[PDB]
């Protein structure tokens, strides 16, 4: 099951194009408080969301603007799309898998018509939160500046 | 330390005056898919916020729309204004206290002026959420309809 990169870590690739900060600079404080579970946020640039791991869907938000994701290594995953963005009640937001599917890498999981979003929400910083981290872990960035979509090797579970 | 009731249950009184709900009934999936933690909500009809319990205050967000407290007892509560209000940057949000303060039943934490926020949100419904439960823990709620700040016995953690 676990996909395992040449340092045998679990393969978690950027599920979206655009800038990769600490969870810190979310300007909610639900997740820069750290209130569901550690992580780290992406500012996109592309409205394509793309899996991160191979896994499991394990919820689809109504709006479509959220995903819950479980990685064959057994962490769990949850990324909302853009701040306060249930307001728009799912406009702007497409949807490409359902609950209970298997994901790849690189699977497109979300499309977002940011134009339609942009100018309604506070910020389109999207958190990519670990739900059940073990005690003791931390998420760690390691890329900078700009991520692409499926890039490898951006963050660490230490 | 904690306060108790004649059943020997620690006292926890309603902190808003309006309709009382399940935590399911929020149009919000962070909340009603118990993302934080098991709760309730309540539908506010006035915009002021009262402590439910004796405690500490261990948060108050920027925004002055959800504050974190800690009963004498231990159980950690947030209690969330409203949904997606961050947005409004606090405007409309004024708040009386400040953390580390010690908090009694009914004493006022914060005000709110629903008509400033009312058009902004897409729902006034707050959710009160029990973010630290044992394992095995379920809020129930036992009022039913409408409750006002500071009557007792409205929820039930069993």
Do not use: C
């Not at 800038?19 to 996109?44: N, R």
Request: no cysteine; aromatic share 6%; proline share 7%.
């Amino acid at each position: 099951e676990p996909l395992q990169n040449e340092i045998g870590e679990e393969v978690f690739v950027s599920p979206i194009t655009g800038e990769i900060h600490p969870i810190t600079d979310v300007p909610d404080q639900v997740f820069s408080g750290k209130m569901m579970g550690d992580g780290f946020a992406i500012l996109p640039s592309e409205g394509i969301v793309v899996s991160p791991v191979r896994g499991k869907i394990l919820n689809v938000f109504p709006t479509k603007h959220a995903i819950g994701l479980q990685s064959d290594g057994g962490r769990e995953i949850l990324i909302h799309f853009g701040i306060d963005t249930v307001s728009l009640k799912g406009e702007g937001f497409t949807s490409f898998v359902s609950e209970g599917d298997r994901v790849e890498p690189g699977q497109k999981l979300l499309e977002v018509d940011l134009d339609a979003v942009k100018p309604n929400v506070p910020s389109l910083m999207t958190p990519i939160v670990f739900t059940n981290l073990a005690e003791g872990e931390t998420v760690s960035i390691k890329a900078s500046g700009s991520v692409n979509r499926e890039q490898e090797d951006i963050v660490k579970i230490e």
